[PDB]
């Protein structure tokens, strides 16, 4: 999930 | 949570500083509009704003106190409401027009370029007209938008088994402080105590209409993706699939 | 001038409590198991009959008859499912895990799975009832919130008509605050609670939009015949 | 001749 990765990056 | 020890002034200041930037469209103004090109310009814009939204959320006091899972859930729920309220804010001083971007200002009849879209324009425009009627201030705008982030998905946190509403105390504590902040801002502007609760309710009832527009907007975008009018970014496809339709 | 704008808070509450529609019964035969079709028939039968009481309740909302007939139609067409839903949620407050559509029709979330796509709606309604319970929502607050929905949900879609409505909406806000002061809440708690109650309306709007699409989905699947009145309230949301 | 229309009038 893109949102997931963007949130932790 | 240090977000709970913030004064009203610190809350306002923190939210103002977290504000994402206003982005530009790639629109070539010497080129014509078609249903597909307009949808392309708008979804392209949205996708880029989404990345700035995610980093804005991380700057909203108390948001990072939440698990990654809760964060994901909230943003998935609020994203369109949050894009739209910013749009309506940007368009306040352009009556009858929507300022999607500084180089992408469209009137109502330009909405008719996309099938089903002018209905959405009309709602965004009426909301913009309400913002003007109320003389909405930027400080209240950032409070409203942060409230949308924390509130919209808060009652859709269900337990894995039994699916009963999960108690999210921290989220409600933050929302309560944003309430404290809004009242403080109104008292400082000289609104009477009675005007304060009246203006508070007026601002919050705006969110009901923003939800409505979000759901009708979501269905419209969904309709286009399914008619293959415009290709959607993976981020956008995923933000859309988090919803039901 | 007007009439609602000269009501005290106590009189607003008294008026709203008096306008309240009765709690209707379902024609449910409890000796027979449900089908998808029987469930839908029961629920739409009930809703159709509540619609008739609602229209008559709406005329009893202070300041509602001041509006043109076509503005009255517009507000009801927009808020009707929201009004039925908050009603349902309010009736189900004292029944954790259950939805009291009628006194003789109290359903669990597993019975939402009788109708295709219905359990997702049930869960949102159950979640809202749980939240009412968490706040210990009061009946006087409830009636205020329901009148707010009627007057608010379509008011942007309309301007003396719109400024009048906003004056009435401010009186209801005063009434809500009055009740909280009367209950001994501090100033800060009154402001907080008001916000908490009104933010619930954002979720109720969401449930209405989702339920509207489900109901429309059930109309195409033509599992049960809907009444003309229900069809017209539904079709008002299409397009 | 919308039903809601009639119900409101009467
Ligand atoms: C009017 C309705 C009929 C049924 C079919 C649905 C389908 O999901 C379930 O909830 C219904 C409802 C809501 C409130 C009420 O007082 C009665 C029925 C609402 C619908 C969303
Ligand atoms: C992101 C959107 C999706 C659908 C709802 C529409 C078309 O109806 C497409 O793009 C619009 C939009 C809104 C706000 C924003 O910040 C960027 C684009 C907005 C809508 C105008």
Going from the C-alpha of C209 to that of each of B76, B195, B209, the distances in angstroms are: 17, 32, 11
Please indicate whether residue B141, judged by its CB atom, sits closer than 6 Å to ligand 2.
no
Residue owning tokens 């913002």: B131
Nearest CA to B100 among B58, B142, B132, B128? Answer: B128
Measured in angstroms, how far is the CA atom of residue B46 from the centroid of ligand 2?
7
Coil/strand/helix, residue B215: helix
One DSSP character per residue, chain C reads --SGGG--HHHHHHHHHHHPPP-PPP---TTS---HHHHHHHHHHHHHHHHHHHHHHHTTSTTSTTS-HHHHHHHHHHHHHHHHHHHHHHHTTTSTTEEEEETTEEEEGGGGGGSTTHHHHHHHHHHHHHHHHHHT--HHHHHHHHHHHHHHTTGGG--HHHHHHHHHHHHHHHHHHHHHHHTT--HHHHHHHHHHHHHHHHHHHHHHHHHHHHHHHHHHTTSSPPPHHHHHHHHTT--
Q: How many domains does chain B have?
A: 1
CB–CB of B110/B32 below 8 Å? no
Nearest CA to C40 among C205, C211, C209? Answer: C211
Is residue C167 a known part of a binding site? Answer: no
Kindly tell me the burial class for residue B95, based on how many C-beta atoms sit within 10 Å of its own C-beta (0-12, 13-18, 19 or more): exposed
- Cα–Cα dist B175/B150, whole Å: 7
- Cα–Cα dist C169/C96, whole Å: 31
Residues of chain B positioned with their CB less than 8 A from the CB of C127: 155-156, 158, 164-165
Q: Is A6 left (phi over 0), alpha (psi -120 to 50) or beta?
A: alpha
Please indicate whether residue B20, judged by its CB atom, sits closer than 6 Å to ligand 2.
no
Please tell me the distance in Å from C11's CA to the nearest CA on chain B. Answer: 18
Give the pair of three-digit tokens for residue C81. 């499912």
Judge whether D6 is closer than 8 Å to chain C, CB to CB. Answer: no
Nearest CA to B143 among B172, B176, B99? Answer: B176
Please indicate whether residue C84, judged by its CB atom, sits closer than 6 Å to ligand 1.
yes
- CA nearest ligand 1 atom 8, residue: C118
**Interface of chain C toward chain B, CB-CB under 8 angstroms:** 96-97, 109, 120, 123-124, 126-128, 130-131, 134, 148, 152-153, 156-157, 166, 169-170, 173-174, 176-177, 187-188, 190-192, 194-196, 198-206, 209-210, 213, 239
Angle at CA C223, nearest 5°, toward C222 and C225? 70
Q: HSE of B117 in the Cβ direction (CA atoms, 13 Å)?
A: 21
How long is chain A?
A: 9
Q: Would you call B72 and A6 a contact, using CB atoms and an 8 Å cutoff?
A: no
- Cα–Cα dist B112/B91, whole Å: 18
Q: What is the largest CA-CA distance in chain B?
A: 57
Contacts of C154 (CB under 8 A, 6+ apart): C74, C75, C77, C78, C79
Judge whether D4 is closer than 8 Å to chain C, CB to CB. Answer: yes
Q: Which residues of A1-9 are buried (b: 16+ CB within 10 A; e: fewer)?
A: ebbeebbee
Angle at CA C19, nearest 5°, toward C13 and C23? 115
Nearest CA to C200 among C40, C105, C80, C85? Answer: C85
CB–CB of B61/B166 below 8 Å? no
Dihedral sign for Cα atoms in the order A3, A9, B3, B6:
negative
Please tell me the distance in Å from B72's CA to the nearest CA on chain A. Answer: 6
Give first-to-last CA distance, chain C, whole Å: 37
Tell me which residue range forms the domain holding C102.
Answer: 1-239
Give B105's strand partners: B99
Contacts of C42 (CB under 8 A, 6+ apart): C26, C27, C28, C101, C105
CB–CB of B150/B174 below 8 Å? yes
Q: Which residues of C150-164 are buried (b: 16+ CB within 10 A; e: fewer)?
A: bbbbbbbbeeeebeb
| Ligand 1 atom nearest to CA at C212 | 21
Nearest CA to B210 among C206, C170, C214? Answer: C206
Specify the resolution in Å: 2.2
Give first-to-last CA distance, chain A, whole Å: 13
Nearest CA to B153 among B209, B208, B71, B222? Answer: B71
Q: Chains B, C: CB contacts under 8 A, how many?
A: 116
Residue owning tokens 């379902």: C26
Give the pair of three-digit tokens for residue D9. 């009038």
What CATH number does the domain containing C45 carry?
1.10.565.10
CB–CB of B126/C157 below 8 Å? yes
Please tell me the distance in Å from B136's CA to the nearest CA on chain C. Answer: 16
- CA nearest ligand 1 atom 21, residue: C211
């Amino acid at each position: 999930k893109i949102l997931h990765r963007l949130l932790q990056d | 949570s240090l977000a709970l020890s913030l004064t009203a002034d610190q809350m306002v200041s923190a939210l103002l500083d977290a504000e994402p930037p206003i982005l530009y469209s790639e629109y070539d103004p010497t080129r014509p509009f078609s249903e597909a090109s307009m949808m392309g310009l708008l979804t392209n814009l949205a996708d880029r704003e989404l990345v700035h939204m995610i980093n804005w959320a991380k700057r909203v006091p108390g948001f990072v106190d939440l698990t990654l899972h809760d964060q994901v859930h909230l943003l998935e729920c609020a994203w369109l409401e949050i894009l739209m309220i910013g749009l309506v804010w940007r368009s306040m001083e352009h009556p009858g027009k929507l300022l999607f971007a500084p180089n992408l200002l469209l009137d109502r009849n330009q909405g008719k370029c996309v099938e089903g879209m002018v209905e959405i324009f009309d709602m965004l425009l009426a909301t913009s007209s309400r913002f003007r009627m109320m003389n909405l201030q930027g400080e209240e705008f950032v409070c409203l938008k942060s409230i949308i982030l924390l509130n919209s998905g808060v009652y859709t946190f269900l337990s894995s088994t039994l699916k009963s509403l999960e108690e999210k105390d921290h989220i409600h504590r933050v929302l309560d402080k944003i309430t404290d902040t809004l009242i403080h801002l109104m008292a400082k502007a000289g609104l009477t105590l009675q005007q304060q609760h009246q203006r508070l309710a007026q601002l919050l009832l705006i969110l009901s209409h923003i939800r409505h527009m979000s759901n009708k907007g979501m269905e419209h975008l969904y309709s286009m993706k399914c008619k293959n009018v415009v290709p959607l970014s993976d981020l956008l496809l995923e933000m859309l699939d988090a919803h039901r339709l």
